[PDB]
Design an enzyme around this catalytic site. Structure first.
Site, PDB file in Angstrom:
ATOM      1  N   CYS A  30       0.862  -1.217   0.131  1.00 13.33           N
ATOM      2  CA  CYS A  30       0.003   0.067   0.130  1.00 13.33           C
ATOM      3  C   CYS A  30       0.840   1.335   0.018  1.00 13.33           C
ATOM      4  O   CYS A  30       1.669   1.260   0.736  1.00 13.33           O
ATOM      5  CB  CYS A  30      -0.879  -0.124   1.184  1.00 13.33           C
ATOM      6  SG  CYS A  30      -1.776   1.313   1.624  1.00 13.33           S
ATOM      7  N   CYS A  33      -0.086   4.002   2.940  1.00 10.48           N
ATOM      8  CA  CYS A  33       0.254   3.124   4.142  1.00 10.48           C
ATOM      9  C   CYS A  33       1.788   3.609   4.506  1.00 10.48           C
ATOM     10  O   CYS A  33       2.270   3.932   5.782  1.00 10.48           O
ATOM     11  CB  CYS A  33      -0.120   1.776   4.144  1.00 10.48           C
ATOM     12  SG  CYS A  33      -1.656   1.454   3.670  1.00 10.48           S
TER      13      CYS A  33
END
Lengths: 105, 579
Positions: A30, A33
């Site tokens: 991600c 993230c």
RNA sequence: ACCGCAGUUUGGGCGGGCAGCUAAUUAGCUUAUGACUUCUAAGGCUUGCCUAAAAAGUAAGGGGGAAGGCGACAACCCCCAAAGACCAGCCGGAACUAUGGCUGGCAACUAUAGUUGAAACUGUCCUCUUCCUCUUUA
DNA sequence: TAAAGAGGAAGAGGACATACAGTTGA
DNA sequence: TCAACTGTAT
């Protein structure tokens, strides 16, 4: 400093454990993230004692995320003795998370 | 640039065609929005990479400087409390500001999934994972004494609430462009919104979705795509903090205007009062002063719009100075020469010279010699504008009555709706109710009253702005909005911001000047002394010091503030005043 | 007051305009965030009569015929009239009062001379915020 | 009088107001 | 045979 969470112990570690616990839902592929991980590490070291922080990889603890209304990552859940005191979604900026915690604590 | 609004009459068949066109444009708008949201990820990724590079450079330059100051600098952002630093360290703090927002990261090993946006384009993005299951909803029965910055407030809590379906994970996968299913452009990637300007591909998509082929012309497709481009650009601009993602349009929010930004009307026959535009048979004009206002013998129609309003159907024609045309003709050539000769070539300089010359010609085409009169203007509570010489202009008192009438009619409509709903339920039907004819008539009346209020305010603002622009060359304008800290209901009917903007534009066009002095200490200051005086009434003011020439002489507070604004504007004349 | 119609607004123009007082169905004053028809849930006085939310409709330049409408009324036919009221310059610190005055010309109405013929107009899209109404809780 | 929903409107405030190749066709 | 429409470029 951040504790790494698992499905099997989540109930005790998060629900029975005393004090407020900020759980971040995580994955490695991600983008945002990885944008916010440094901020979470910072908050881990600034607020010691005033707050405890935990990380949960969805890719290794797939069962937990559904149980708590989570549909996309990154997500932050602030729990207080068995109930989520606060909820937030999306990659906050440093200041945003800071005043978020300030208000919620 | 100006816009002329001409009323037109449409036949029933023309109205049906207009409705079909608006439905088609709504479908196009939804499709474009979906495509742009699906595509935003590719921009976000490049932005993130650049941000990472910047953070790395900042980290390097922060470490490379001396250890004594770097620790305190790091702490400056690494801590809520901020002390008063010296210029030396403060400079580096500014130089590494970026740490205030983010801390360095890698963004490597990533896979480019399609993101889901939130309330901004850059921060708050997320990658979806699953659908269905229960979801968090506010429960007002739960009162949490949250100790916010304003102390303890009993905020309504949240709890898990019934889900739509069983919780199911989404199939993670990288982003992929969408393409036209078939036709002459099979396989083309829709990189940008401009790729959707094709009738062929849109027809193919509609066939894929099992909808009838498009009937609207390409001009209105282009106009709608222009609107969406504008809204998206506003959304992504950081400098605007109030523009957010465009919204999907539901059946109750259909487009209400057809926009042709490619060509003027095909024909404007003034003798028989007929307008021929694309996609319609000729439309009759029921306007009596359109030939005088449009002024075709000295202007140049550029673009137009078919608009629908509670008062009727209108055509908007945009007109400009005759020179405008060559300017554009040259402007659209700039990208060519730049690509062909490079910005240093003599052609480039010559073209810029010609653009500048035409622009100056247009500008001076509407300059008027004045009398060099300076005015101070203060928006008031009782008077819309007070002027330095004592003039008080009454507001548009008529619109308050329209607003009250709207209040009463809405009360009536809601009462009717409640009674009808009760009778519907009593009969024993669970299906949603169908609106009645009386309710429709009453709703039409309310819509018409809202329109009339808006139009009345607009007309009053145009008249007042024209008056001020004609009379005065130098205008000073500043508003003391401290009163806001019903008054809001009254002020929402005056439209001060529109008045100010119109006056600003009209004064600039005539060649005057427009100033906006600061507001510090404007209402309480004795303008002839500068000392803080006293008020003996709601609108009167008296100076304090005995040395004042106007000592112990009550005066209008609005006039005082207007004269103070005139002084702060730099004109300082204030020779005379009425009462 | 308000409503409809004159491109959109303001002052005005033609029309629709509840109820009370005074004079002689038609003229004045007070006054309503429109007027009127049909049928009904409800309410009022005493078995009948009244007031009526909702619902569905009628008209909103003047006069004369006229199929058809339960009705307000009117398809269609004939005559009259035609206000968001003209043009071009020059003054104006143009408010109070949503633009005052002078000159020239052009229209209309009166007794060759007078009166009237006012102002403005740059809209659209989008996103946030505000307002309003109706509910529910306190 | 207060606060939260639903639905109907508006005001703030910023931009914007296309040109040439190629094709149709009646 | 020229208006009108669509495609390409920004």
């Amino acid at each position: 400093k951040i504790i790494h969470l698992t499905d099997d112990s989540f109930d005790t570690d998060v629900l029975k454990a005393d004090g407020a616990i900020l759980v971040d839902f995580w994955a490695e592929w991600c983008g945002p993230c990885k944008m916010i991980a440094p901020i979470l590490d910072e908050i881990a070291d600034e607020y010691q004692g005033k707050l405890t922080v935990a990380k949960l990889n969805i890719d290794q603890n797939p069962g937990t995320a559904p149980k708590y209304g989570i549909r996309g990552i990154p997500t932050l859940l602030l729990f207080k003795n068995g109930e989520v005191a606060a909820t937030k979604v999306g990659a906050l900026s440093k200041g945003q998370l800071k005043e978020f915690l300030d208000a919620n604590l | 640039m100006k816009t002329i609004k001409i009323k037109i009459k449409l036949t029933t068949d023309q109205v049906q065609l207009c409705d079909r066109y608006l439905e088609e444009l709504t479908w196009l708008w939804n499709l474009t929005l979906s495509n742009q949201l699906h595509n935003h990820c590719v921009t976000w990724y490049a932005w993130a990479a650049k941000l990472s590079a910047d953070l790395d450079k900042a980290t390097e330059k922060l470490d490379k400087l001396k250890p004594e100051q770097q620790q305190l600098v790091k702490d400056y952002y690494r801590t809520k409390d901020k002390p008063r630093l010296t210029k030396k360290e403060q400079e580096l703090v500014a130089k590494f500001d970026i740490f205030a927002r983010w801390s360095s990261f890698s963004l490597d090993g990533i896979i480019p999934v399609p993101l889901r946006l939130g309330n901004s384009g850059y921060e708050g993005l997320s990658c979806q994972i699953a659908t269905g299951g229960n979801y968090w909803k506010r429960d007002e029965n739960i009162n949490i004494p949250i100790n916010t910055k304003k102390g303890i407030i009993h905020v309504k809590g949240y709890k898990l609430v019934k889900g739509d379906k069983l919780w199911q994970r989404i199939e993670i996968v990288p982003h992929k462009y969408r393409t036209f299913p078939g036709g002459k452009f099979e396989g083309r990637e829709l990189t940008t919104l401009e790729k959707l300007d094709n009738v062929n591909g849109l027809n193919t998509l509609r066939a894929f979705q099992n909808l009838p082929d498009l009937q609207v012309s390409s001009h209105y497709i282009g106009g709608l795509l222009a609107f969406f481009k504008e809204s998206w650009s506003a959304f992504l601009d950081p400098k605007r903090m109030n523009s957010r993602k465009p919204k999907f349009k539901k059946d109750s929010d259909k487009i209400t205007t057809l926009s042709n930004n490619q060509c003027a009307p095909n024909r404007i026959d003034v003798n028989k009062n007929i307008v021929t535009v694309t996609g319609f048979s000729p439309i009759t004009i029921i306007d009596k002063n359109w030939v005088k206002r449009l002024n075709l013998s000295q202007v140049l129609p550029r673009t137009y719009m078919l608009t629908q309003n509670p008062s009727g159907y209108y055509i908007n024609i945009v007109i400009a100075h005759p020179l405008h045309e060559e300017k554009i003709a040259l402007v659209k050539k700039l990208p060519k020469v730049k690509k062909e000769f490079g910005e240093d070539s003599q052609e480039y300089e010559d073209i810029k010279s010609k653009i500048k010359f035409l622009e100056q010609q247009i500008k001076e085409s509407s300059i008027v010699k004045g009398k060099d009169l300076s005015v101070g203007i203060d928006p008031g509570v009782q008077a819309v504008v007070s002027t330095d010489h004592g003039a008080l202009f009454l507001p548009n008192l008529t619109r308050e009555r329209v607003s009250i009438h709207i209040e009463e009619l809405q009360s009536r409509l809601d009462n009717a709706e409640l009674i009808n709903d009760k009778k519907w339920k009593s009969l024993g039907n669970k299906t949603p109710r169908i609106k009645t004819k009386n309710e429709t008539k009453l709703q039409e009346k309310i819509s018409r009253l809202h329109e009339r209020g808006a139009n009345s305010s607009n007309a009053f603002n145009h008249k007042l702005s024209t008056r001020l622009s004609r009379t005065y060359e130098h205008i000073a304008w500043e508003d003391t909005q401290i009163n806001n800290l019903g008054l809001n209901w009254i002020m929402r009917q005056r439209c001060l911001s529109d008045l100010k903007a119109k006056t600003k534009q009209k004064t600039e066009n005539r060649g005057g000047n427009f100033h906006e002095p600061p507001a510090n200490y404007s209402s309480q200051t004795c303008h002839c002394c500068g000392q803080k005086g006293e008020r003996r009434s709601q609108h009167e003011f008296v100076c304090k010091n005995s040395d004042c020439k106007l000592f112990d002489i009550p005066q209008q507070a609005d006039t005082n503030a207007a004269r103070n604004h005139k002084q702060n504007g730099g004109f300082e004349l204030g020779e005379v005043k009425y009462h």
